Amino acid sequence: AKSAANKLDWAKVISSLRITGSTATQLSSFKKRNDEARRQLLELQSQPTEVDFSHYR
Amino acid sequence: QDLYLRELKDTKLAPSTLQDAEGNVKPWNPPQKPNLPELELQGPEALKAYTEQNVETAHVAKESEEGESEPIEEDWLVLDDAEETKESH
Amino acid sequence: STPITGKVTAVIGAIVDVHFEQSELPAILNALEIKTPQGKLVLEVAQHLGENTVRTIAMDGTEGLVRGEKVLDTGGPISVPVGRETLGRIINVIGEPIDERGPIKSKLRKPIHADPPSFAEQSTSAEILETGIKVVDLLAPYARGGKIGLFGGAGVGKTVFIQELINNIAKAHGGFSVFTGVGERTREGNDLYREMKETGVINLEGESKVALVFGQMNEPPGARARVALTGLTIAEYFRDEEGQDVLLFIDNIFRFTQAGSEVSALLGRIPSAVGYQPTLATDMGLLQERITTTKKGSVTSVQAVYVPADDLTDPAPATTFAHLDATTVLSRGISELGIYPAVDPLDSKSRLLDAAVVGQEHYDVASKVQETLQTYKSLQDIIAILGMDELSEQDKLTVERARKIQRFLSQPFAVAEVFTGIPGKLVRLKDTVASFKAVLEGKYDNIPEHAFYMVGGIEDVVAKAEKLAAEAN
Amino acid sequence: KAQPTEVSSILEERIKGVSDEANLNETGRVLAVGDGIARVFGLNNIQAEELVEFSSGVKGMALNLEPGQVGIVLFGSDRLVKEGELVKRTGNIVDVPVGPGLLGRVVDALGNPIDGKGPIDAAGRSRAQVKAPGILPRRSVHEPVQTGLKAVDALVPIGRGQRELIIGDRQTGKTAVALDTILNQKRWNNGSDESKKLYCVYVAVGQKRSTVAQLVQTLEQHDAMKYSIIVAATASEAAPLQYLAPFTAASIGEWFRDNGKHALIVYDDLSKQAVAYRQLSLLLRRPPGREAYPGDVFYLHSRLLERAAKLSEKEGSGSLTALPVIETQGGDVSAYIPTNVISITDGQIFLEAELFYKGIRPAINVGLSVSRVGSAAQVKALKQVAGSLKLFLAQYREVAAFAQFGSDLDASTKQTLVRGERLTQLLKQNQYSPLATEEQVPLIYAGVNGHLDGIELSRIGEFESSFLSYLKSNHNELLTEIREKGELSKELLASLKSATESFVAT
Amino acid sequence: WVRYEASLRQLEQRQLAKSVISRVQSELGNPKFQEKVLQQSISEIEQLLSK
């Protein structure tokens, strides 16, 4: 999924050789990498959102 | 032997009312009760912030919308601007 | 109780041996007493020799000491007055007011020798104290809860740097300050006393925010080695009982180890390296560990060290390096180059210079400044013999930028304006980092290098260049 | 809290029981006390190096056993001791508690819990002076210790049981590499495979308590304290305690080593160990040696360091890796203790301020920094499969060997110049950012097939970061395959080359 | 709310330290010092009689 999302992004960079000066498609790809990179970090740092009534309480 | 028993007894007279019981404290002039369990009970939240992060303020996330759902006045302009770029492309 | 009394057997320079009686042996580091015609001579006990004999250290001169004189035991370590009343009163190694402003009316008296505050230690290494001096703010920020280096040889300007700090920090700060002044010239102490009087920091009929301790080189070695602890005791009383931010100041910590070496030879111990005391690291650590941030309170201590014969590898400076976070070497070569302050930017160094604390932009600016200055030192040998024309174009650009930078690190002081003729100036951190980054980018390379000397911000450099091109050229 | 009250009551009752069961008569009498030294008349049958108790409550170790009176050093201050005090004998040689409850705690040289988190659960009690393993009960170093530093991994390998010295100057980064290794071990310290676990044990001899407070705050922030033990000997403590602490920590690590586990010891600033021993020997009127140091400082360091070893399969194939630190004055490695320690260790890691101010953050002098073990104790992925990771040492020697004296002659010289300077800019790393072998391999592999085409020097850092991103995304198969198998197969070499050239074209 | 409890643990021991001052000041004002020598006498008898 994550590798599949940008797999087609390596298709547009090949498509970008004939189309030079793309204002926002790369930015949209940049945006879809900026938020997605924020996704993996968010879930990996995400502890189980709970207070351990057994131990931590 | 007694010299340990009596100091063990001494631990049951001077600090018995200190924490073992709640008979305040005889040697001290300042009281023991209105410091820790009432003034310093809120002490941990007197060190951190109150009514905002101890209550924790479980706040609804601010909702962000799409591009105002107004495509016609921008998609064609983008399409017109796409013509401008592809002439320069 | 009965007064513990004994007989003096040996008086060896500053070392006195006392023979006592049945089970009358005093404690180590405990004040004794000799009724001298001049006054009171206390005999701090250093070691026990057995046979009811103890080896002691005299805090005053041992003139007129006859063997067999009556001695008296105080019963504890040297006791000094402590409290807010000490503010504005100049005291001594023993605690008597030497300001002749009447007797001291202290409420508490505390022992001189204490212990380090265990692991009740906080670590708040995030408070960059705004000093005003351009060089220190960039490459070695001073922490508000740390210990400050100030190294350097004779006549390198360490005391002037201390006066600049006391001018810029003490005035605009909420919290008491203590100046111990170990083994400096009495002239310097007198000037410092006067200046705090006129400035208003201490008022003879006011509040006063400084407790003045003083031990000069006129004191014998024992007093010069104990006065630092006496001032530290005042600092500790103000940090604990009052719960204030104290600002301990000394003039020279090297004199403490020097006096320790003085007393060590006659104390009867095998000499250590280059004739120092064997108990150098231990005693110096005992002295400099009591000075600490101390969870209930906080302290900043601007240390000051004298390097013997401009040797940075001398055992005392080498040992005191490890107990300091922010350091300042004040190399002499910079002094004969005319750049005052004479601090060496390549050896200043501090822990707070990290991107998380000082900021990413500041870290990058400091790193690039270090590179520009270090390229000059690397190419010095080639430049000295052959010349700059034998260098590459990039080498020429780097060396001229380095010259401009190292000339721009200079800053006038409000204390040493008599030695410069230029009024003192202060530069904020945000201003100096921006100016240095602007110079690094190459925005100012047509400006003559002389325009960076005795200036503040980059705007001052621009103005100086304008004048230089106007009338000078 | 009434519970500590009865705990103290039963403490006092066994205190009485222990105290009134001695009836000793050889209990000596203090003749004289010096600066932390006390000669005592008595203890006729005292053992050497044996612990004692003074009537005040201060401990002492029996160094000198000359006839008549005995030389006792003081674990603490001579504050409370006088002449004519009865000196209690322990009956045993100085000992330190050992066990698995040490993890997550901070103790002193003796081993008392000093962090203030309660008592210590000790599985045993070992000597401070134990004999190093013999010639046979050991095995050569083969398993590599992953430092997380590319310059310390691909260039100067270290492994289980070796002795790598961080030689260098003051505030050059000596503690940085050690703490980075401690943080890097978290990757495998969180698993289940005990053969890959590396518990960390660290000594702090002479460093001020504020520094160790910042350090322990550091390990707990990155969640490394759970597998680390800190023994502290600040300059405030007496010289005997500082002199003893590294030996106690060596025993602590040897517990894991003999129990089949793997552990890492950092002998931080072993020089102040030497100066504390100097103070000890001089205060004992022992004849000094060269430059006032005691003669047997070489033996002191040898006995301490050689205890670290890689055991053989017969005893359990445990390991103990020594990581000592020595600070030199003005880069003078010809100094006595620096020479002894460079001759005692299994290699060294030189750090100098000049490269530090040149921009190189690790400041590793690859010219002098050498390891006595090369191919052994190195992950194979950073080895012959990568090819040049057998011989970057020669390449970095030659690039330094033609800087201006070996001025560029032809295109080969220019190519080597660009390659070397790009690599030196590539080896840079930042503190508190340990890395892993599976992403070491791609970066340096790119250093052989396309590195001069890097996007100018100031932007090769985000080049390496973006290369790591382009290999962690859409190319996780390469990273995995090279991280479990640990080497690069022929098809794996082809895939890695293809990926490197694909991002080169990018 | 944990280190406050931990600080509650540490502070509680601290007034127990000054409690010992109250305890020890109670220890010095007794005729037990006369009675305590008999405690050694019976104890030292039990000590060497064991041997």
Ligand SMILES: Nc1ncnc2c1ncn2[C@@H]1O[C@H](COP(=O)(O)OP(=O)(O)OP(=O)(O)O)[C@@H](O)[C@H]1O
């Ligand atoms: N900022 C400055 N501007 C001008 N002159 C300065 C400055 N700082 C120091 N000096 C000069 O340096 C010289 C020595 O000054 P100072 O008394 O501070 O020396 P020092 O290093 O503290 O001395 P010592 O080793 O005797 O304690 C004086 O001639 C003084 O004018």
Ligand SMILES: Nc1ncnc2c1ncn2[C@@H]1O[C@H](COP(=O)(O)OP(=O)(O)OP(=O)(O)O)[C@@H](O)[C@H]1O
């Ligand atoms: N990779 C790095 N990136 C950034 N800063 C670093 C790096 N390595 C070291 N430093 C900095 O270098 C300085 C010294 O590093 P470190 O804490 O390892 O000290 P050290 O060399 O062990 O010296 P000491 O003997 O004085 O403790 C510190 O200011 C630290 O932040």
Ligand SMILES: [Mg+2]
């Ligand atoms: Mg001076």
Ligand SMILES: [Mg+2]
């Ligand atoms: Mg370090």
